[PDB]
Every structure is written in C-alpha cells, then in structure tokens.
A paper describes a structure:
The cholesterol-dependent cytolysin (CDC), pneumolysin is a virulence factor of the human pathogen Streptococcus pneumoniae (pneumococcus)2, the leading cause of bacterial pneumonia and a major agent of meningitis and septicaemia as well as debilitating diseases such as otitis media, septic arthritis, keratitis and sinusitis. A central feature of the toxin is the formation of transmembrane pores in cholesterol-containing membranes, which lyse or disrupt cell functioning, depending on the concentration. Pneumolysin and other CDCs bind to mammalian membranes through a tryptophan-rich loop and a threonine-leucine pair within a membrane-binding domain at the base of the toxin. Once bound to the membrane, monomers then oligomerise to form a pre-pore complex that subsequently undergoes a complex set of structural transitions to form a transmembrane pore, typically comprising 30–50 subunits.
In this work, we have determined the structure of pneumolysin at 1.98 Å resolution. The best crystals were obtained from protein containing substitutions Asp385Asn and Cys432Ala. The asymmetric unit contained a single molecule having the characteristic four domain structure of a CDC, with three non-contiguous domains (domains 1–3) linked to the C-terminal membrane-binding domain via the strap-like domain 2. The tryptophan-rich loop, projects from the base of domain 4 in the structure of full-length pneumolysin, reflecting the likely membrane-binding conformation. Notably, two of the tryptophan residues, Trp433 and Trp435, shown previously to be important for membrane binding and cell lysis, project outwards, so are in position to allow interactions with a lipid bilayer. A striking feature of pneumolysin crystals, is that monomers pack side-by-side in the crystal lattice, resembling the molecular packing of the pre-pore complex. The interface between pneumolysin molecules is created by the concave face of one monomer packing against the convex face of its neighbour. Intermolecular contacts are made by all four domains, but mostly involve domains 1 and 4. Although most of the residues at the interface are polar, there are relatively few polar intermolecular interactions: salt bridges between Asp8 and Arg226 and Glu434 and Arg399 and hydrogen bonds between the side-chain of Asn339 and the carbonyl group of Pro87, and between the hydroxyl group of Tyr461 and the amine and carbonyl groups of His407.
Residue numbers in the entry: 1 to 293, 298 to 471
C-alpha cells in the first residue's frame, strides 16, 4: 500500500553524498610571526604558523548524560542540528526492529533482541533486561575487559578541539577550563585526551528494504509534514557504544620540548624517577577531568590522579549499565556510512627555550696566554627577520698569567660561540701555540675551560656541566 510507495520514495530521495554533512570552521591566511624575548633565565623563541585540521569520521561522541534522543534506531533529521551534534528526532509511529549485541559468552540467538516499538525507554529496557541476565550468567564469573580507546591532541583553539572531538565539545571544553591565552603567549602547553572504555555495542544489522523500517499508519507519503525532503532527509542510528569516557586536560607551564613525551609516559603505567625533566614537567602539570558513565563530573588536581581515572571502570560489571558514549549513523537508502567532514584553521604556537649559561676560564699554566672569544646575540626584528649582533669578550687578546680565573655570562640568545686559546712558547720563530680552538660551541649550562702545564706541554680540560 502506502509503504510500497515509501520504499520507492526513499529510494528516490536524491541527496548529495559526503557533501550534505560537510561543515567548515573559521578561516585565516598564512602570516609569518616569529619573536624572541629574553626572560631572565631563558631566551624564548615563539613561532606562530597557520595550521589546518580536518577530520572525516563515522563516530559521534556523546556528551549528554540523559540521552532522550540518542537511542539506537532513532531517526534524526539531516540538518544544521545534526552537524552541530544537537540533533532533532522525528517521532510519530515506528515499526518493530531487531538489534544485535557483541557481548562475549552469548549464544548466537541470544545476541539478538526484537523490539516492538523502538523508543528510548523501549530499547533501553530490552538492552537492560538482557544485560541484567548477562551479568549473572557470565559477567560475574568471568573477567571481561572493556575495550579501551585513546585520542589526544595539543590544544591551540576551541574550534580545533571541536573539529577533533565533535561540534558539541565546547561545553565540556569550557568545563575543562583550557587556558588558550597562555598557549598563545608561549607560557603554557596543553594536551587534551579523550579516553573511552567500551563495555558493549548495540548495533542494527542490514535493512533489506528502506520501507521495512516503517509500519503503515499515518502520513506515509504525507511525511513531508515538517521538512523531510531530498534536501532535509532522514538518518537512523546504526549503532550505539555504551561504557565510560573521560576528557582529560593536561596543562603544564613548562616550555620544554619533552612535554608530549612526559604526558605519554604519564598516561601509561610508567613511573617517572625524580631529578628528571619529565618529573619536573609532571610536577608543574595541572590536571582537569570530565567523567561520564549520575551525570558528568568535573574533577581537578595533580598528575597522580590520572592513574585512578584510567583504571576505574576497566572491567564491565553490574551496578552500572554504562552510558552511551558514542553513536554511529547510516542513511536510510542503503548501507551508506554517514561520515562527518569537519575542518578548521587554527594558529599553532611553537615555543623553543634556550637556557642561559656560563663560560668559566681557568689559567694556571706556566706561560702567557691569550683568549679570543666571540659570539653572536640573536634577535628577531618586527618583520620576524633573524638578526645577529656580534660580541666579544672585553679582555680578548690581553696577556694573562697564572692564576687567572673568570666567569662569562652568556644569555640564551647567544649563537656561534667561538673560543681560541693560545700560549707564548718563548721559542724563536714559533712564538705562539694554540692550546684550544673551537667554533659553534654549544651553550651548555656551565662550561669550564682550564689550561695548565708548561710552554712546551700545555694541557687543557673542556669540562661540561649541563646537569
């Protein structure tokens, strides 16, 4: 009857593949800015570059504790509200649907549910009954691990993070209290980590006919009621992943290039030994977190809190059905995956710190010695151009005897450090002999160049203490 018209009507729905779900964020064009600022202990080089991030994915992350709309097999509009992950459901009258669940220990036939009139309470009711039986049958006498998924990203802008984690991330992100300002100023580095623990997945298998999803009751072709066209078409929820998920902000004041490594070591089981750079970074890291799966909670504190956050809910048991943490949609017409294409431009701030240092000289040789020590001071002008300003030790070329000592302060902007040391041999037609000569000397924390011995046999030590 009218459903035979629905089959071919939906099959006649002509809509643009991959394009109707495409959205793009804010835009900006390539502009070079590179500055160098002398902080009292470090020279800091900040480099900003236009970057783009694009994602194309099937999974939609759930941020709402109470679903109301995100039950499996729900039909949602393909609309502005869908892209922004705040969908609008069209509810009138639904036909029965079969579902499947991937729990281990379930005999094949028992993995299938048959729901009469699909709704939130309906489907969740079925699933919860099934689970109640499964926890006693299998769950409490077996050790079943949840499936674990990590995603992570360095934070630069809220739009970037929206593209990464979903268009409805902003509320959660606001709860994480992300200091984008300090990332832009080069004073902080921030990583966002999404951790998902999947207990089970309720999925809908292939739909033979597009009409099978419907009874025959009311407004069958008249379903053009409110905006259901080849321009504003329908989707159904192909699957919903249930479990627990955590959004984790790791925010450090370190300017080090070992931040990501330390964060990675932290997320894993690795315990970090003291007096390490990792240990210092993690000491200076603030942790914020949003836990889901009676609602979403905001916890805060130090790095040690991460372990627990990750271990909790690792084994699926009763006392919690888990909440929908993800869902995946497929178009009515065919097996078509509904992939969401998002992209945005963002400003990437890169920071490089150059530790200040000291060059110490000790002369205890039985000879006249001369030093020739030169370097460049690095600056960036207002056009971001590299400028090198030549500098020299003020006692260059002067005759020095034992026991001479000095300390030469070298800020982090020092480049092209050259040290040459020679001694007067007292020999006719070989008046000078080079004791030491190096160029491009690394600006370590503490370098001590000592010379001793005699005119004939001068000796030298180049001692590096970079701690």
């Amino acid at each position: 009857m009218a459903n035979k018209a629905v089959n071919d009507f939906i099959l006649a729905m002509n809509y643009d593949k991959k394009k109707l779900l495409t959205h793009q964020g804010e835009s900006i064009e390539n502009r070079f800015i590179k500055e160098g600022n002398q902080l009292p202990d470090e020279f800091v080089v900040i480099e900003r570059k236009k970057r783009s991030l694009s994602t194309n994915t099937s999974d939609i992350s759930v941020t709402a504790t109470n679903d109301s709309r995100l039950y499996p097999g729900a039909l949602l509009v393909v609309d502005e509200t869908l892209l922004e992950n705040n969908p609008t459901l069209l509810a009138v009258d639904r036909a029965p649907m079969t579902y499947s669940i991937d729990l281990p220990g379930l005999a094949s036939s028992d993995s299938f549910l048959q729901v009469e009139d699909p709704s939130n309470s309906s489907v969740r009711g079925a699933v919860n009954d099934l689970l109640a039986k499964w926890h006693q049958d299998y769950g409490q006498v077996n050790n079943v691990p949840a499936r674990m998924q990590y995603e992570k990203i360095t934070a630069h802008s809220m739009e970037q993070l929206k593209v990464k984690f979903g268009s409805d991330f902003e509320k959660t992100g606001n709860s994480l209290d992300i200091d984008f300002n300090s990332v832009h100023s080069g004073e902080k580095q921030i990583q966002i980590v999404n951790f998902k623990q999947i207990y089970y997945t309720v999925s809908v298998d292939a739909v033979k006919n597009p009409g099978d999803v419907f009874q025959d009751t009311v407004t069958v072709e008249d379903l053009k009621q409110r905006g259901i066209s080849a321009e504003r078409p329908l989707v159904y929820i192909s699957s919903v992943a249930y479990g627990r998920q955590v959004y984790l902000k790791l925010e450090t004041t370190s300017k080090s290039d070992e931040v990501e490594a330390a964060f990675e070591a932290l997320i894993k089981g690795v315990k970090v030994a003291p007096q390490t750079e990792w240990k210092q970074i993690l000491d200076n890291t603030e942790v914020k977190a949003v836990i889901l799966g009676s609602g979403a909670r905001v916890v805060t504190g130090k790095v040690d809190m991460v372990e627990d956050l990750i271990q909790e809910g690792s084994r699926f048991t009763a006392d919690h059905p888990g909440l929908p943490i993800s869902y995946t949609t497929s178009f009515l017409r065919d097996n078509v995956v509904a992939t969401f294409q998002n992209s945005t431009d963002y400003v990437e701030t890169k920071v490089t710190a150059y530790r200040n240092g000291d060059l110490l000289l000790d002369h205890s040789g039985a000879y006249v010695a001369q030093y020739y020590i030169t370097w460049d001071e690095l600056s960036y002008n207002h056009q971001g151009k590299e400028v090198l300003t030549p500098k020299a030790w003020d006692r260059n070329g002067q005759d020095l005897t034992a026991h001479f000592t000095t300390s030469i302060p070298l800020k982090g902007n020092v480049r092209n450090l050259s040290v040459k040391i020679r001694e007067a041999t007292g020999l006719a037609w070989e008046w000078w002999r080079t004791v030491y000569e190096k160029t491009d000397l690394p600006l370590v924390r503490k370098r001590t160049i000592s010379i001793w011995g005699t005119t004939l046999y001068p000796q030298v030590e180049d001692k590096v203490e970079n701690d």
